[PDB]
Amino acid sequence: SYPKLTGTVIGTQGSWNNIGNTIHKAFDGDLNTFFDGPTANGCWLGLDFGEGVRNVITQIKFCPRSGYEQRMIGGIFQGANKEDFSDAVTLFTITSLPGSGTLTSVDVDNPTGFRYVRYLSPDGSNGNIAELQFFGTPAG
Numbered sequence: 001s002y003p004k005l006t007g008t009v010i011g012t013q014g015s016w017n018n019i020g021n022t023i024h025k026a027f028d029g030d031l032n033t034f035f036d037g038p039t040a041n042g043c044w045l046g047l048d049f050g051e052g053v054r055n056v057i058t059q060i061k062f063c064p065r066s067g068y069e070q071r072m073i074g075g076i077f078q079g080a081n082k083e084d085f086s087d088a089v090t091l092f093t094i095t096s097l098p099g100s101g102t103l104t105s106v107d108v109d110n111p112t113g114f115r116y117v118r119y120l121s122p123d124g125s126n127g128n129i130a131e132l133q134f135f136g137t138p139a140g
């Protein structure tokens, strides 16, 4: 069990109907608060660990938005070393309905060190996710 990783929150700007459920709601420790993106499609969020910082990812945990758990199916998690994710690799693909009101934990088996990680949401989701956490260790 490796430590939870910290970084700068990156991703889609804004929120649905300008209510204020921005990407930051996925990193606040509250499973009741969620990201609700401004558009149905294209929403994403994640971390930049910082210039010169690369982590090997060993585990990801996530919690869906309550009542909208199906909006995570088909979402993927990616690691990259370009902020545009053009070099990205998929670390995990959500294929089953996540349980409500809890963190689902998934193992990652990829030895690559990444500066950037993200959740890339499927069409029709508004990016909906309540909490997102990455675990791992500095790349050797």
Ligand SMILES: [Ca+2]
Binding pocket: 025, 026, 027, 028, 029, 030, 031, 032, 033, 034, 130, 131
């Ligand atoms: Ca939250």
